[PDB]
Amino acid sequence: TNILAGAAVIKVLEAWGVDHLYGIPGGSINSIMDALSAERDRIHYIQVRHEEVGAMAAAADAKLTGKIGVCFGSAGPGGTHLMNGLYDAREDHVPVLALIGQFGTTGMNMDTFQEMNENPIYADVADYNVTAVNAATLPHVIDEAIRRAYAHQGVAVVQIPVDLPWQQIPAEDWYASANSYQTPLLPEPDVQAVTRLTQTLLAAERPLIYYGIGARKAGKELEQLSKTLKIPLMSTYPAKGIVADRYPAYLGSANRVAQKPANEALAQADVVLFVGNNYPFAEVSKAFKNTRYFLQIDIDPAKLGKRHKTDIAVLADAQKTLAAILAQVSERESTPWWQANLANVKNWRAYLASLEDKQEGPLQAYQVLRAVNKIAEPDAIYSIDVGDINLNANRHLKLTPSNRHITSNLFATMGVGIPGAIAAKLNYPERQVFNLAGDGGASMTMQDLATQVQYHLPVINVVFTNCQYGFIKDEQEDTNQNDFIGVEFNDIDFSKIADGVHMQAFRVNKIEQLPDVFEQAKAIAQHEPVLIDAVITGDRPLPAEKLRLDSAMSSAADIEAFKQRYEAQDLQPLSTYLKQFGL
Amino acid sequence: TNILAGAAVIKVLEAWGVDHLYGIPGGSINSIMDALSAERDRIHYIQVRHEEVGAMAAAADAKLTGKIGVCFGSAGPGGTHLMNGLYDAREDHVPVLALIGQFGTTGMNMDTFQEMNENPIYADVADYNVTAVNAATLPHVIDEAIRRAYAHQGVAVVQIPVDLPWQQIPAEDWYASANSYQTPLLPEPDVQAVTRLTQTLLAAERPLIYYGIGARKAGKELEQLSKTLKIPLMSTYPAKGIVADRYPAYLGSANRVAQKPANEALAQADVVLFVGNNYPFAEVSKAFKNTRYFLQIDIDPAKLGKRHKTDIAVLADAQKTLAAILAQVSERESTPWWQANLANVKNWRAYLASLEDKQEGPLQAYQVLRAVNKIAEPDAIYSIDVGDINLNANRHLKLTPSNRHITSNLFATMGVGIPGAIAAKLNYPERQVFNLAGDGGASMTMQDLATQVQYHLPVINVVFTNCQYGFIKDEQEDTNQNDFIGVEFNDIDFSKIADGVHMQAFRVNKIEQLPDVFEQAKAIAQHEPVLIDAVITGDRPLPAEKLRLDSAMSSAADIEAFKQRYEAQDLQPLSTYLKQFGL
Amino acid sequence: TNILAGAAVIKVLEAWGVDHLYGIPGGSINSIMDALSAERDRIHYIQVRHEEVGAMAAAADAKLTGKIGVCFGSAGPGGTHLMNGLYDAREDHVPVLALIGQFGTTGMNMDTFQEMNENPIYADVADYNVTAVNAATLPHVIDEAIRRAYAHQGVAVVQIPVDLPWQQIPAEDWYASANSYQTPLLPEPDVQAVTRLTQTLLAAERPLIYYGIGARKAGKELEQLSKTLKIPLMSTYPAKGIVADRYPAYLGSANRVAQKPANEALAQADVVLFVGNNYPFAEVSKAFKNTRYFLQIDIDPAKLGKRHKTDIAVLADAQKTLAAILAQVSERESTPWWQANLANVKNWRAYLASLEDKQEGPLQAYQVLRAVNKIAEPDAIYSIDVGDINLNANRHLKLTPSNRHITSNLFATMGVGIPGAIAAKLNYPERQVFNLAGDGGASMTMQDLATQVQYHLPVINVVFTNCQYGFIKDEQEDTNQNDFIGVEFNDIDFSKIADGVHMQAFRVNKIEQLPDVFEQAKAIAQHEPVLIDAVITGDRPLPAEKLRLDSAMSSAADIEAFKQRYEAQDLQPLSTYLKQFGL
């Protein structure tokens, strides 16, 4: 007995637990479509309006769940539209399978309609990149692609000539290897190495623990190490929320999508424990230029000593290692360094609250995010686009271990807010989901607001309309000789865009309008998507990478100007607190 | 004395006559931005809302004018968004320069933010693909890119580390080679070869001349050869309009974006003169399977004998060769073959008019295109998206040599309607410009309706809203076993989308609504863009590749069903006319 | 009724006039081998000992005859061994077809033995690069590859799964387009532009005509223009021989594989006519820094203004353009510039003769090449390897239009001497063929001396054994601060290598041994290959790019050291001759 090869391919996807996949049909992929059509009860096809949104959503599925995301594109332009999401998956090292339509084998290499050698298109993005040429082996090739995407934490691409999935193959020969999949059991971190790292950390005068998302399983240990040892915590931006933002010794992140206390403390630290962290600004920003000892914990040999000359680098799991450190230490009394950092954080959080707490007047991003906080459930998921929203969300969202947030961390493709939210709601239909996006990024993927409507995905979309590429405008202010260019543009009314795709929506431009609009949105999103278009000022957010508050470091005139522009009259530099506690 | 390298790069663009260019800024391209900002009087930067639209518009500039189109994208995701337009330019063999942002040379290869080796990304699409590494040679590298894009009729990509354009270079050293550019003077076609081709063509019983856009300069000669010799004309779809559609012996195009008379005549012809033609369906459709002699005229040696075994292939310019044929022939009396084809065309055009001429009821694509015809100026330009609109526009638009029409001919990327119209209006601000697009394709690039508003580009946008990927639905009807999938979707109200980007718009769903809406649109578009969202039926357009009208070829039941579905009761098969005139 | 697809492929090669092709069999290409075996009376397979030699020989075939060269390699390592020859073909812009074995379609993408995705391997080198997936279209794919390689003057690569050539296909369907082949049209010169060019050339005070191999059809015109107008000639190294070396106003080539008079004159010229020339050193050596007017003639628009800004650029065939110049000028009287250059050439040639004319003592390269000249037929063909031999052969070989010489002009891969001579003897069995090679380059392809023996190809191989990479040693002398490294090595006795492959051979180390050995070799090579291993001194050949003879430019100490090292006591700088004639 026989099975169509395409039917077998869909059963391989099912065997691996793929719940949903994204794409747009075409003749060159209609035989995979045909197989999907027969399997609607067991795999859920999501028709997007642009294939980039399918690729981005597949990446987001894997970011959220750790399960492979799946997308497809038709021959030629369908597949090339996947690129921004495939590069996101590559750079954020998450498993994605991409299927690319191709002309049948009888027409390949004939220079027929929309027929090209597609393999070179995907060679750079993909861990695995093959054109299938046989029906009987096609299930194996898909299985191989999936297994490699997982093993190698990246993108597998298969170009499929459209004739193959309509061929009959023997029913009993194909298989999936999902049944073999497992995660490794690791040795203990060695006691001796943990031990010497630990002594160096404890001997420090001005220690910091600086973690990334490799420490995602270690939030409890991080906070308890911090509290017991009196060592402040800082993180990469993506690692926000691993430790609750409310934790009083959480300094935030460094560089620009950053918080003041983290930058200031890092400049003063003598020892940094760098754990589960691949911070891409380390070298270019000279982050560690005056660090005395640099200690690392990472699971990947490729990372050991990568970002700075490392005194001790432990190849181990972050949680297991941090637990092993915790088990060999005990209480230290409060130190001046601890107290100075606590005071600095309190001052900073008072500044952010002063921005949030305005009650009337021209709307700024700060109050919009306060309004999000006010309607957010404790386990909400945030899909965040790319721009000033990363900076502002990093400062204002009040996250805990129960939340998730995703963006395009390293490729930093705009437009990911909408697709990430689609994926979040598909995976977690009982959890509240936000899409927080600037106007520039929302406009790139705006058509796929219709996908939220079509699939009844109750995302709360919040568009930050400044009529700018604000993140880039501020860069031009900093570097460009000549006038601003390409960074200020006409308005788009996203409430009207929403209406056009048949989504309920609101537009607001005044602080006092927020509470009732956000309460209405919270309620609508019990059952249907909603959009809030927040018309915000062009105020530049405080640049944590260009602080002008320390009279030993900056002129009085520069400090006065900084305080004025950034509403920062009550911020004190870290040195004030260092001095207060005798450092 | 010195000049900034970026300033020199902009002067190279100016030297080559580049009027306008497209892109979105980013830090990684802010030094090119800076140079553009100082040169606003002499080069016009168009800020798009998605970089794919900039790439597509650059391709369209070159399709329209023959001048190189220019676009750019920021590092990583800005550049990868260009792909669908770059592949369009490659496949439609038009010159485009693409500039890609990159991290400064001091941070390249550090694994910093959004920093990657960008060169492999563009290797497949590009004729020329380099990463610049020196400021003093950067003007030369841009000059080289332009010169190669022209010479090789394709895409040149330059990745530019952002530090280089801010470096000073000696003022007197750089140059542009635009001053050297010229077009070749060719020899005559040889008299002997033209002569033997001509005899074979004239000896035929059932000749056809089948031209593509390589014959774009030869419309006069084509029509006069046809009339003098009594030889019907057929074309590739893109070659519509080279000879006026009204010409009574213009049969149309073959395959699917096709007209009935062309398919039918081609099946019967004994000799085809294939001129300036690279029809991609030739082999797969067995177009020439019963052609006795196949004659070719083409400028490119790579094309000689490519699509079919060729009896005589003349390497020459199409116009010069067709003129040389015309100069050696004279009047032939009407033949039965001529008369049969004339009769067949009249019957077909009566069918199309019957569809157009309905006055009331549910709106179909056919009447929308009649309404376009009624408001179109004689020299209007049409940017056409990808889908059923190619099929329907091919049949219904009444073009002459004074018109232009463009689509993505071979890559066939959806979304090109909007960008092509932007480019058309930028090049030809005094000419009427239409964007004719299906709902699927319009939705992919809908955000760049805002670019038409921002730049006050008075495009007439007509969206054909069937709530389907209709072209693909019909494919699934033809090939798929299982139910339709991914081809029927929710409505988007493009009048509301238009309102959201601050464009005047209308939505219509009834035939009787068309005249006043189209008259209003015609008037608005004297000064501002406008959009008409035409809600059309799901009726399948007649498939010229699956005709069921000939009782020697098809069952009576199949013919009855075809006539019913396609409103084709009064169409006669070509064989009726052949018989009438004694063949 | 049916034909094997492999048989049809070989028939395509035969239709295109392929006489011989090179490679090494493997399982992965045994079905093409089987088809070759059946066709061995009409197409001739040459089994090489290393696939690189097959690729190099294929490139040399095309360099010599203009006929596409054909090579193949087995899957994986057979094909990757082709690379140095394929890149040679790309860079020297000659047509080559390369066939690459691949696993059968049932085993592709299974990760079986020596099975990989081969398409990305060839993407950079190839103009056309496809994996065949169907037997019936395989003849067309090969035809396409050939037609493109010719039209685009580069490499076409086809990966062939081994099952396809053993499949039956319909006998009637396949064809070759060889019948339709034509070479590109030759554009014609604009008559105004040529008149303006001529005027500028004639108004020059210190003109030069500087041609490359694009002027290979124009030697008569070049020499006559030089004589009529009293304008010296210089060329690219590859263009040596287009005008006979004995012509008294031939200055030679510039840069390093160069002759003194050319460098010196170019530095003083006010007007250069740059014809059929893509000299790669133009910019980096600042060749044209002081040139007032630059006049260019080239067929390729990609070249116009490439190497320097043009004052007049003519997109036309070199011989037609030079003929048109010649036709509008008449005899001009001698000038001071003309006489100064003639005197400089005489002085230079007397130097070279002095080196050649030694009759006893330690053997130098110079006398070896004199001995070559003494046994060389007037229509001899020289295959030249890469290193000091290019420099020395350029100075000493006495070539005329009746000769050919080839090397790897631009990629400059060592090892080409032996394959180029194989190809030359295959294409020109009645012409004398030399392989002139350094010991380093001969070593790299030494095993294919056996191929000359096996096919009874009577090449005269001359190996220049200095026990050095001499060309590179001299570079280290010029740039490196530390001691020589990697450039002096142990001896290989190539007369023993030749004995090992069963080739007659001689080793010489003294000038007085040359005449008898070379006469013996001349006679042996009436019927069989022969090798002369010339043990030469480590003397550095005079560096034409670092002249130290002009006491206005150089210290007496540096002049005296140069004269002593290079036996150049009788050389005078061009300024001596300029001054004699009042310049």
Ligand SMILES: Cc1cc2nc3c(=O)[nH]c(=O)nc-3n(C[C@H](O)[C@H](O)[C@H](O)COP(=O)(O)OP(=O)(O)OC[C@H]3O[C@@H](n4cnc5c(N)ncnc54)[C@H](O)[C@@H]3O)c2cc1C
């Ligand atoms: C517009 C924008 C601007 C940005 N700018 C900033 C900025 O100013 N500041 C900032 O902080 N970020 C910024 N980012 C994000 C930044 O680009 C990097 O993605 C981020 O800093 C790196 O975070 P990470 O190290 O947590 O994650 P990753 O780069 O994913 O690294 C995770 C590390 O954990 C290790 N690992 C994984 N699992 C384990 C385990 N079980 N045990 C141990 N180790 C493990 C990995 O091997 C790896 O080294 C920005 C993002 C955007 C969108």
Ligand SMILES: Cc1cc2nc3c(=O)[nH]c(=O)nc-3n(C[C@H](O)[C@H](O)[C@H](O)COP(=O)(O)OP(=O)(O)OC[C@H]3O[C@@H](n4cnc5c(N)ncnc54)[C@H](O)[C@@H]3O)c2cc1C
């Ligand atoms: C959705 C969609 C469906 C389509 N399906 C169809 C269809 O059913 N039917 C159809 O006809 N098209 C169809 N097309 C277009 C099709 O893909 C090809 O692009 C088109 O048929 C080729 O047209 P062409 O030969 O005129 O142009 P090109 O492919 O650009 O070829 C031009 C030829 O002219 C030669 N040339 C150039 N200049 C000269 C000169 N001066 N003198 C002589 N020769 C010269 C070139 O060398 C080349 O061979 C479709 C397009 C779309 C978007």
Ligand SMILES: Cc1cc2nc3c(=O)[nH]c(=O)nc-3n(C[C@H](O)[C@H](O)[C@H](O)COP(=O)(O)OP(=O)(O)OC[C@H]3O[C@@H](n4cnc5c(N)ncnc54)[C@H](O)[C@@H]3O)c2cc1C
């Ligand atoms: C070890 C080594 C060192 C070398 N160093 C030197 C050196 O010091 N000096 C030196 O001179 N060379 C040197 N070379 C060779 C050098 O690398 C270049 O290959 C050579 O200078 C370029 O020669 P060309 O312009 O004649 O050929 P090409 O680069 O092949 O250019 C031919 C030109 O002719 C044009 N053309 C073709 N047909 C026509 C036509 N019908 N009419 C008009 N134009 C036409 C083409 O478009 C092209 O621009 C060296 C080679 C080796 C192996």
Ligand SMILES: CC1=C(CCOP(=O)(O)OP(=O)(O)O)S/C(=C(\C)O)N1Cc1cnc(C)nc1N
């Ligand atoms: C234009 C832009 C950005 C502007 C985003 O504008 P938004 O309007 O979305 O956000 P805001 O800052 O105004 O709130 S940020 C980004 C950097 C971080 O890479 N770039 C460059 C960029 C350009 N194009 C794409 C597709 N993705 C990108 N990341």
Ligand SMILES: CC1=C(CCOP(=O)(O)OP(=O)(O)O)S/C(=C(\C)O)N1Cc1cnc(C)nc1N
């Ligand atoms: C989905 C689709 C098409 C549907 C277009 O839907 P539209 O709604 O735009 O048009 P209509 O037919 O309903 O009037 S046509 C096309 C073929 C010709 O390639 N494809 C495949 C396709 C898929 N994705 C992109 C970006 N471009 C493509 N060409």
Ligand SMILES: CC1=C(CCOP(=O)(O)OP(=O)(O)O)S/C(=C(\C)O)N1Cc1cnc(C)nc1N
């Ligand atoms: C090693 C070397 C050269 C040394 C050649 O040594 P030879 O011993 O052959 O010649 P000679 O100079 O001693 O007479 S020249 C060359 C340059 C021109 O590229 N290179 C670099 C080189 C290195 N490797 C290969 C395969 N090809 C090359 N061209």
Ligand SMILES: [Mg+2]
């Ligand atoms: Mg914005």
Ligand SMILES: [Mg+2]
């Ligand atoms: Mg549609």
Ligand SMILES: [Mg+2]
């Ligand atoms: Mg040597």
